[PDB]
Scaffold this active site. Sequence first.
Site, short mmCIF file in Angstrom:
data_model
loop_
_atom_site.label_atom_id
_atom_site.label_comp_id
_atom_site.label_asym_id
_atom_site.label_seq_id
_atom_site.Cartn_x
_atom_site.Cartn_y
_atom_site.Cartn_z
N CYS A 70 44.04 -74.85 -62.85
CA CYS A 70 44.96 -75.98 -62.90
C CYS A 70 44.93 -76.77 -61.59
O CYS A 70 43.95 -77.47 -61.32
CB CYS A 70 46.36 -75.49 -63.24
SG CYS A 70 47.47 -76.80 -63.83
N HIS B 150 43.28 -79.30 -63.74
CA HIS B 150 44.17 -80.06 -64.60
C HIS B 150 43.80 -81.53 -64.52
O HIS B 150 43.38 -82.01 -63.45
CB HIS B 150 45.63 -79.86 -64.20
CG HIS B 150 46.61 -80.31 -65.23
ND1 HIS B 150 47.06 -81.61 -65.31
CD2 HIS B 150 47.21 -79.65 -66.24
CE1 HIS B 150 47.90 -81.73 -66.32
NE2 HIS B 150 48.01 -80.55 -66.90
#
Lengths: 188, 188
Positions: free
Chosen positions: B105, B125
């Site tokens: 992420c 992400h």
Amino acid sequence: ASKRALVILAKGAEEMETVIPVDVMRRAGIKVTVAGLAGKDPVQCSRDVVICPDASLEDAKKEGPYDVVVLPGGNLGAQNLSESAAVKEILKEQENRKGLIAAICAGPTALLAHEIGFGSKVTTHPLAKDKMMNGGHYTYSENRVEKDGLILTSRGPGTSFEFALAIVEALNGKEVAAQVKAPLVLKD
Amino acid sequence: ASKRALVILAKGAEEMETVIPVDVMRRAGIKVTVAGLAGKDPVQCSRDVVICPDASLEDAKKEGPYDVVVLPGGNLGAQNLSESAAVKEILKEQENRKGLIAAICAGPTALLAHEIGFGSKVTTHPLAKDKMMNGGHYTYSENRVEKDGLILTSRGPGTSFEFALAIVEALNGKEVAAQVKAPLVLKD
């Protein structure tokens, strides 16, 4: 005007099935209370992740009512939930006031122990099916998430995201659930 | 003959991206150490889940080496990882001994801060892409899990299970990963 969720955390609980719904529900603006069954002390989960609860169950009981009561799984966690008179009282009250009850994996077997939601369609982890179906008091489903009336059940750690988003949809509606879901990068 | 994993836990870390890999890796028989960046004290994660680490980073540093170093996400958690000299030292050492480095992420942005793995294909992400690509030191991928050499990256909370199983496959092989996966009730 804020919805409230109670998550009951006992030793041996599956930590993934605890953290995912707490996290997702708070992303949805729900006020979540992670209550320790045995008190305020840290709780050693099934894979040795140690979580500090927000409150003891005794204290959280007094600050109800809750729009959803959440029962995580984990075999030993579910057994502790099944044996607790405090949990029986919380669930029976929640059933009477027609509040939502949510349990995942081995968690639903606590509903049987406390005679909650008899006659409902439910799902469990495949390994907990025989335990849940003792007596034929429920109808078994193999859906990843199952909702029958006020009883919402799910199958395992890998269904935790769908389980949690189903709670959000029941409390805050389909649009909030969709908004909360997009930044998670879920497959489906 | 047991593989070891180091998970670095800092304030603001995404609790789902921390607990899922720890849980899954321990299901695979990996010895996981959840090390607190700031010490042994409990760590308040991004959605206010509080986790007790197994050890301080200073102590865990001494009980290496580790077969994988895991960097969870969470914007504020990743910033704390990016600013820590202790993390820089651990990652550079891990890079030199050709150990596996895993980040999910926002976690991969710490690799850029510490000049780790330049030239590798990585994912983040979507909201962390611009930060990761400052300077063009990596090649960006939109795969849910990306592995290039010793750098393993993933995109978000919803990819945590695939991220974790990819670590298991790299350390213990495809069969162990498949055995660990089946009881989770994952969709794919």
